Design an enzyme around this catalytic site. Structure first.
Site, PDB file in Angstrom:
ATOM      1  N   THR C   1       0.856  -1.234   0.003  1.00  0.00           N
ATOM      2  CA  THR C   1       0.085  -0.064   0.025  1.00  0.00           C
ATOM      3  C   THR C   1       0.898   1.403  -0.141  1.00  0.00           C
ATOM      4  O   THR C   1       1.646   1.466   1.053  1.00  0.00           O
ATOM      5  CB  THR C   1      -0.871   0.145   1.257  1.00  0.00           C
ATOM      6  OG1 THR C   1      -1.728  -1.098   1.109  1.00  0.00           O
ATOM      7  CG2 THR C   1      -1.666   1.220   1.232  1.00  0.00           C
ATOM      8  N   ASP C  17      -1.327   2.490  -6.038  1.00  0.00           N
ATOM      9  CA  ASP C  17      -0.894   1.105  -6.593  1.00  0.00           C
ATOM     10  C   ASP C  17      -2.347   0.394  -6.575  1.00  0.00           C
ATOM     11  O   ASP C  17      -3.717   0.911  -6.119  1.00  0.00           O
ATOM     12  CB  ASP C  17       0.166   0.218  -6.216  1.00  0.00           C
ATOM     13  CG  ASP C  17      -0.059   0.081  -4.669  1.00  0.00           C
ATOM     14  OD1 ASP C  17      -0.879   0.674  -3.939  1.00  0.00           O
ATOM     15  OD2 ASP C  17       0.626  -0.673  -4.107  1.00  0.00           O
ATOM     16  N   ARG C  19      -3.182  -2.839  -5.096  1.00  0.00           N
ATOM     17  CA  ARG C  19      -2.885  -4.388  -4.128  1.00  0.00           C
ATOM     18  C   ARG C  19      -3.645  -4.273  -3.022  1.00  0.00           C
ATOM     19  O   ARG C  19      -3.543  -3.585  -2.058  1.00  0.00           O
ATOM     20  CB  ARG C  19      -1.420  -4.526  -4.045  1.00  0.00           C
ATOM     21  CG  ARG C  19      -0.727  -4.843  -5.068  1.00  0.00           C
ATOM     22  CD  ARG C  19       0.839  -5.220  -4.691  1.00  0.00           C
ATOM     23  NE  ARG C  19       0.920  -6.748  -3.948  1.00  0.00           N
ATOM     24  CZ  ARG C  19       1.957  -7.044  -3.445  1.00  0.00           C
ATOM     25  NH1 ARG C  19       3.071  -6.666  -3.705  1.00  0.00           N
ATOM     26  NH2 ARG C  19       1.957  -8.138  -2.816  1.00  0.00           N
ATOM     27  N   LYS C  33      -7.935   2.303  -5.246  1.00  0.00           N
ATOM     28  CA  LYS C  33      -7.784   3.089  -3.960  1.00  0.00           C
ATOM     29  C   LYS C  33      -7.965   4.600  -3.974  1.00  0.00           C
ATOM     30  O   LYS C  33      -8.137   5.128  -2.849  1.00  0.00           O
ATOM     31  CB  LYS C  33      -6.253   2.857  -3.216  1.00  0.00           C
ATOM     32  CG  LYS C  33      -6.186   1.245  -2.946  1.00  0.00           C
ATOM     33  CD  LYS C  33      -4.793   1.188  -2.391  1.00  0.00           C
ATOM     34  CE  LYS C  33      -4.566  -0.324  -2.064  1.00  0.00           C
ATOM     35  NZ  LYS C  33      -3.007  -0.404  -1.475  1.00  0.00           N
ATOM     36  N   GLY C  47      -5.000   2.035   4.991  1.00  0.00           N
ATOM     37  CA  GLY C  47      -5.218   1.429   6.111  1.00  0.00           C
ATOM     38  C   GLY C  47      -6.381   0.473   6.057  1.00  0.00           C
ATOM     39  O   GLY C  47      -6.384  -0.278   5.199  1.00  0.00           O
ATOM     40  N   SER C 129       2.220   1.953   3.478  1.00  0.00           N
ATOM     41  CA  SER C 129       3.169   1.160   3.713  1.00  0.00           C
ATOM     42  C   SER C 129       4.855   1.599   3.087  1.00  0.00           C
ATOM     43  O   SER C 129       5.657   1.761   3.784  1.00  0.00           O
ATOM     44  CB  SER C 129       3.174  -0.544   3.519  1.00  0.00           C
ATOM     45  OG  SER C 129       3.027  -0.619   2.288  1.00  0.00           O
ATOM     46  N   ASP C 166       8.556  -2.366  -1.931  1.00  0.00           N
ATOM     47  CA  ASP C 166       7.765  -2.803  -0.723  1.00  0.00           C
ATOM     48  C   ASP C 166       7.124  -4.125  -1.159  1.00  0.00           C
ATOM     49  O   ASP C 166       6.927  -4.233  -2.143  1.00  0.00           O
ATOM     50  CB  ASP C 166       6.728  -1.517  -0.471  1.00  0.00           C
ATOM     51  CG  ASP C 166       5.758  -2.125   0.699  1.00  0.00           C
ATOM     52  OD1 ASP C 166       6.213  -1.824   1.633  1.00  0.00           O
ATOM     53  OD2 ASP C 166       4.764  -2.277   0.402  1.00  0.00           O
ATOM     54  N   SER C 169       3.315  -3.674  -2.043  1.00  0.00           N
ATOM     55  CA  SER C 169       2.936  -2.745  -3.061  1.00  0.00           C
ATOM     56  C   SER C 169       3.614  -3.416  -4.427  1.00  0.00           C
ATOM     57  O   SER C 169       4.513  -4.385  -4.420  1.00  0.00           O
ATOM     58  CB  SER C 169       3.577  -1.294  -2.713  1.00  0.00           C
ATOM     59  OG  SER C 169       2.920  -0.994  -1.320  1.00  0.00           O
TER      60      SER C 169
END
Lengths: 52, 239, 220, 240, 48, 250, 232
Positions: C1, C17, C19, C33, C47, C129, C166, C169
């Protein structure tokens, strides 16, 4: 349809063209339909005298 | 909240909604209930059906427990919700004390429910009266009544409804000891009362008895014509 | 994220992204998102995704309602005010890291919203993240009043840092460009990673499975 | 025309009317006051009079002008007891706008809200529906000045010229002849035409002590109330 | 031509049709006077 | 304040009360509905009031409301009052279904509704409902059933009942033409068209002016068919053929 | 304080709800307006005259959008309208926050009519005094509904409300059919607004909003002046 006023115009135009093309009793009948048609319009503002 | 005192005193000391409600009780169908020594016999008159469509929904004789049956008069709407609360209450007695409910106790619940209902705010009083017939433990058959003021009141015989004072005048002029000798003789006394009621062209009666141990039992209209046949025969030879 | 945004010389660029990773298991590969707020204000969520969704439906419902009452354009500080008023009341139990962005009459405005209620205006934000790697990209290569193609380049590369650095991500980069008159939402901006093609044809045929009971019911 | 308690509570007449609010409109006229507000090309002027009959009374406390917000001014007609409470409601709800939204409330939005509150009293048959009126001004971005009037009936409208009270109909009849020539209006033109409305309909030719003028202008969007010195300057400027 | 007004608009038309022949100075009432009258009395049917 | 109270709860000095009897006066006007059955299925005939030439003619029904998946009602009286009643007992059937996971007995549904109608007639100082409605439905206990609500709050079991403007005049012929259990759901249809032929004061029986719904028991369906306007008029002329030869033969 | 908790509307001995009977006259004194659905969407036309030249007609509005594809007008009084307007504005959102979809127009009317009948029975309140005209093109087909202060509703092809609606609906009966367009309903809507309008029908004497499959919107006096142009 909804209108009444243009019916007086087209009956009057028929009363033009039948006598103008020499059809006197049918011109009398179309003129008469313009009379009994024109009897119910609230505002013939110039079409009154145009009919007259 | 609709807080409003409805039941008010009169300047000469009366309760207008109570005395008007008793008039509405005084125009309902007439119900007669008597007790024997082992078998009680109670029944309503003036069924006034359409006589071609359904009839099981118009039943005005219920049971609150196995040992307590209940008849009434007045308007039908107010009665059945009191019956509903009485069923929750009498089942709640068995949720308390293990015995079946005594008919004196449940009539105190009915009258005690009714009086405070006349005492509260924003409430017209009830427009019903009831005959509560119960055969208790140790087999003592008895009955009660319920005034729309909420006064439980025992009897040996009783009759409420439209045309009930003349019927009560018949019941005092016909109630003996030897009439409760045989059970069907007491049933013949009840059918004598409903026959001494009003018109009731044959099919105009709904009776129910209890032998103090059974459930309620309603005869189909064959013992109605049979008991009416022996009653009209006995009156025919007596005349 | 990883969600991020920036204000260039004329508008606001948003990127993310796709995911959703349930634990260490990739649940979704196409999780959008970026979310509608107004015709000039969008938001990016992070979150607890359902908390972000039920929040962003509620507040954009309140701005559709309120702007529908006022008969004019909303403002970014209105939604900022509603969110920072409510999340303080819910006391951080609702987990939602948000990026609020919109170009109102006063112009472009960007905010970062934390689930306890702390907000701030900044020219560029990275949340999620892998927000650290994208913040390194914005810190290394940021310049004020860049053009929108430089903005799409910087935001795309900044998301790409969290893509290739990440664990939770890395998928297609969603972008949106907001100006005083132009709104450009687009999900398939690039495909940084693909799936390899299959080699062994594993096709089974009809009849390789024992069936105990069949049942047919016609429809119309 | 009447049946039941429609002469007493807020229900419908057999003619469909309701008599309580139209009884309350002339409750403004029992105050004995008439106010005029004129909107300019980049300004907004509110002029009204005042009657202080006693030297034992402090003339600094008879103000019907009220600064609702830092850039919002209003004037009250009707009765004082309902009017001051309505001012309290306006200040409170404007502050609530600033807390809920973080910016300045538009004046049509505020007058909409006050009209919504005034709807409730005539909407119920319980409460006394606040026999006083409401006039506000406002400078709005991409709208400039704009003037609104809320009645006790919960109705409101944007005005270009404004009269309210005892000489309201005659003053509006003067102002429609003032506006139908369609003259471009500057600041002191709106001041002069503002004073000559009530000075001729009322026909007083007063000294600067018996009136009060609040004003706002595009330049300095603060609502401000004039000093009697510059009021005297506009008054002798009116005298050619 | 009359879609059922009452028995009083019958006399309301047919008494009125003589005013047409009289205003054009006839001595015999013609049929076009009547259709010249129904559209007037029925206009009063069309009046309120 | 108590000067304004109209006391919609108290009795009359003659024992009765006037409010719900005025409601039962208002129920005589503005509607004509009837129900009939003797066999598999049950019919509700409803005479439409709004017959203006500009109506979209939608919502699947006019005075018919599907209550459960196996029962429905025809309503009469104030429609706006009826709208709260329909969805009001509708989730009472749904909370029965949520409570026991079972379809609801039609009778004890009607009792539960008539309690709620009975409460406003009893206390609270509230204007009651001038709404009376029929009840059709099927159960596993007694099959097809028919019930009739009253604005007082009491109910009743029937098979065939009209609450029209000429309701008792309809009932007078209902007990003049019937058969217990044998009137199949075509003979009761042709009888029903004769009934609404009588109580329909507007003659010639315009097929758009009526609403007729049937309820049959299909094995696991209880088909609540809502007949279209293409099979009404064939039943209309079907009545018209037998009434003419029935007249001329006499 | 508290309310009253007693219904001020009773049945007459004639069996009539008298305050509703008077509220219908309060609607009958309302401003005349009409609305016509014709095969692609609905045209709502009202008649709004300022009482003097001092008013701003660009301040308030009669044609009111409820959501993206639903508009609404009325024929009654002012302050009762905006309240239930705001209520409907809420009810669309309580639909949407559940279903993530705009509401069907019928599903909106089922709630608004319940608000009005619920309100005309409750204690200590006078009923409403407006009637509504509701438009919307949901799932292709347009829709045209009408409510009342009692709380019922109807599905009209075309109707009139306000003053002289008993003549305007006879005009529509002689005027409309099934096959018309939105601009045709504009033209005959001007033709029926001129039946009861004043001497001068300018761009601000009326206010017209329309639904399309693109959704509901409201006209400006530029093209509304184009519609009053070449009219009658």
């Amino acid at each position: 349809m909804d209108d009444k006023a243009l019916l007086v115009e087209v009956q009057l135009l028929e009363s033009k063209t039948y006598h103008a093309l020499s059809n006197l009793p049918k011109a009398r009948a179309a003129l008469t339909s313009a009379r009994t048609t024109a009897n119910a319009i609230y505002c013939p503002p110039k079409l009154q005298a145009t009919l007259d | 909240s609709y807080d409003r005192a409805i039941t008010v005193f009169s300047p000469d000391g009366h309760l207008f909604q109570v005395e008007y409600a008793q008039e509405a009780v005084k125009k309902g169908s007439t119900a007669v209930g008597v007790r024997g020594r082992d078998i009680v016999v109670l029944g309503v008159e003036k069924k006034s059906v359409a006589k071609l469509q359904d009839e099981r929904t118009v039943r005005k004789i219920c049971a609150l427990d196995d040992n307590v049956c209940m008849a009434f008069a007045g308007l039908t709407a107010d009665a059945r919700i009191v019956i509903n609360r009485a069923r929750v209450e009498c089942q709640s007695h068995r949720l308390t004390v293990e015995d079946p409910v005594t008919v004196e106790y449940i009539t105190r619940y009915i009258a005690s429910l009714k009086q405070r209902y006349t005492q509260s705010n924003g409430r017209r009083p009830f427009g019903i009266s009831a005959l509560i017939v119960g055969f208790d433990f140790d087999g003592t058959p008895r009955l009660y009544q319920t005034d729309p003021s909420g006064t439980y009141h025992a009897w040996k015989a009783n009759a409420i409804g439209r045309g009930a004072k003349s019927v009560r005048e018949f019941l005092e002029k016909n109630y003996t000891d030897e009439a409760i000798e045989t059970d069907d003789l007491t049933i013949k006394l009840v059918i004598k009362a409903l026959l001494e009621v009003v018109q009731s062209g044959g099919k105009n009666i709904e009776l129910a008895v209890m032998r103090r141990d059974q459930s309620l039992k309603i005869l189909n209209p064959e013992e109605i014509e049979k008991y009416v046949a022996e009653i009209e025969k006995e009156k025919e030879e007596n005349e | 994220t990883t969600i991020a945004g920036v204000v260039y010389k004329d508008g606001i660029v948003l990127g993310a992204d796709t995911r959703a990773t349930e634990g260490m298991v990739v649940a979704d590969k196409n999780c959008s998102k970026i979310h509608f707020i107004s015709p000039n204000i969008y938001c990016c969520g992070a979150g607890t995704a359902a908390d972000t969704d039920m929040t962003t439906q509620l507040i954009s419902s309140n701005l559709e309602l309120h702007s529908l009452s006022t008969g004019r354009l909303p403002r970014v500080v209105t939604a900022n005010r509603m969110l920072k008023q409510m999340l303080f009341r819910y006391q951080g139990y609702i987990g939602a890291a948000l990026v609020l962005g919109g170009v109102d009459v006063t112009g472009p405005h960007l905010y970062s919203i934390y689930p306890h209620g702390s907000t701030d205006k900044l020219p560029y934000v990275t949340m999620g993240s892998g927000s650290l790697a994208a913040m390194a990209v914005f810190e290394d290569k940021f310049r004020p009043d860049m053009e929108e193609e430089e903005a799409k380049n910087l935001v795309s590369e900044a998301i790409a840092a969290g893509i290739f650095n990440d664990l939770g991500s890395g998928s297609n980069i969603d972008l949106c460009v907001i100006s005083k008159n132009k709104l450009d939402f687009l999900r398939p901006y690039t495909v940084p990673n693909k799936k390899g093609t299959r080699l062994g044809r594993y096709r089974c045929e009809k009849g390789t499975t024992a069936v105990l009971t069949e049942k047919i019911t016609p429809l119309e | 025309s009447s049946a039941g308690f429609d002469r007493h509570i807020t229900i419908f007449s057999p003619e469909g009317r309701l008599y309580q609010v139209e009884y309350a409109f002339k409750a403004i006229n029992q105050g004995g006051l008439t106010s005029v507000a004129v909107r300019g090309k980049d300004c907004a002027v509110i002029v009204t009079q005042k009657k202080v009959p006693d030297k034992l009374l402090d003339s600094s406390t008879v103000t019907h002008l009220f600064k609702i917000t830092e850039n919002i001014g209003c004037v009250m007609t009707g009765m004082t007891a309902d009017s001051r409470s309505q001012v309290q409601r306006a200040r409170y709800e404007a502050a609530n706008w600033k807390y809920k939204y973080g910016y300045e409330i538009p004046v049509d939005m505020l007058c909409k809200r006050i009209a919504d509150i005034s709807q409730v009293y005539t909407q119920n048959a319980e409460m006394r529906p606040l026999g006083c009126c409401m006039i506000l001004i406002g400078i709005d971005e991409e709208q400039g000045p704009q003037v609104y009037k809320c009645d006790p009936a919960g109705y409101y409208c944007g005005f270009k010229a404004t009269a309210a009270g005892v000489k309201q109909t005659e003053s509006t009849s003067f102002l429609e002849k003032k506006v139908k020539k369609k003259f471009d209006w500057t600041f002191e033109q709106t001041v002069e035409t503002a004073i000559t409305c009530l000075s001729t309909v009322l026909s007083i030719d007063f000294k600067p002590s018996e009136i009060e003028v609040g004003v706002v202008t595009v330049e300095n969007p603060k609502f401000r109330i004039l000093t009697e010195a510059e009021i005297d300057a506009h008054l002798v400027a009116l005298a050619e | 031509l009359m879609p059922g007004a009452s028995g009083a608009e019958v006399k309301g038309v047919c008494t009125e049709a003589g005013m047409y022949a009289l205003r054009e100075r006839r001595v015999h009432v013609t049929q076009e006077d009547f259709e010249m009258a129904v559209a007037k009395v029925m206009q009063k049917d069309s009046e309120k | 304040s108590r000067r304004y109270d109209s006391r919609t709860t108290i009795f009359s000095p003659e024992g009765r009360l006037y409010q719900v009897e005025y409601a039962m006066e208002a129920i005589g006007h503005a509607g004509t509905c009837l129900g009939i059955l003797a066999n598999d299925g049950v019919l509700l005939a409803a005479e439409r009031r709004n017959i203006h030439k500009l109506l979209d003619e939608v919502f699947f029904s006019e005075k018919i409301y599907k209550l459960n998946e196996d029962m429905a009602c025809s309503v009469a009286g104030i429609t706006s009052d009826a709208n709260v009643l329909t969805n009001e007992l509708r989730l009472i059937a749904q909370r029965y279904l949520l409570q026991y996971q079972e379809p609801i007995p039609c009778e004890q549904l009607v009792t539960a509704l008539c309690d709620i109608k009975q409460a406003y007639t009893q206390f609270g100082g509230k204007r009651p409902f001038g709404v009376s409605l029929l009840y059709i439905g099927w159960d596993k206990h007694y099959g097809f059933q028919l019930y009739q609500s009253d604005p007082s709050g009491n109910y009743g079991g029937w098979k065939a009942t009209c609450i029209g403007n000429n309701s008792a005049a309809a009932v007078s012929m209902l007990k003049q033409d019937y058969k217990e259990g044998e009137m199949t759901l075509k003979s009761a249809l042709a009888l029903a068209i004769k009934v609404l032929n009588k109580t329909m004061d507007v003659s010639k029986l315009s097929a758009e002016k009526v609403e007729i719904a049937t309820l049959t028991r299909e094995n696991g369906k209880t088909v609540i068919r809502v007949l279209k306007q293409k099979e009404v008029e064939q039943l209309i002329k079907k009545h018209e053929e037998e009434e003419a030869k029935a007249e001329r033969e006499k | 304080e508290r309310g009253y908790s007693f219904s001020l509307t009773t049945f007459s001995p004639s069996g009539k709800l008298v305050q509703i009977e008077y509220a219908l006259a309060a609607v009958a004194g309302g401003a005349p307006s009409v609305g016509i659905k014709a095969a692609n969407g609905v045209v709502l036309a009202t008649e709004k005259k300022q009482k003097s030249i001092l008013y701003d007609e660009r301040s308030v509005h009669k044609v009111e959008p409820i959501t993206k594809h639903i508009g609404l007008v009325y024929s009654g009084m002012g302050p009762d309208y905006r309240v239930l307007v705001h209520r409907a504005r809420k009810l669309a959102q309580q639909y949407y926050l559940v279903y993530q979809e705009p509401i069907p127009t019928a599903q909106l009317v089922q709630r608004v009519a319940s608000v009005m009948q619920e309100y005309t029975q409750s204690g200590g309140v006078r009923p409403f005094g407006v009637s509504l005209l509701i438009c919307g093109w949901n799932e292709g087909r347009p829709y045209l509904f009408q409510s009342d202060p009692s709380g019922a509703y109807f599905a009209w092809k075309a109707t009139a409300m306000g003053k002289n609606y008993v003549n305007g609906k006879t005009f529509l009966e002689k005027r409309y059919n099934e096959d018309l367009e939105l601009e045709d309903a504009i033209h005959t809507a001007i033709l029926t607004l001129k039946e009861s309008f004043e001497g001068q029908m300018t761009e601000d004497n009326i206010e017209v909003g329309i639904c399309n499959e693109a959704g509901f919107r409201r006209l400006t006096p530029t093209e509304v002046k184009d519609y009053l142009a070449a009219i009658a």
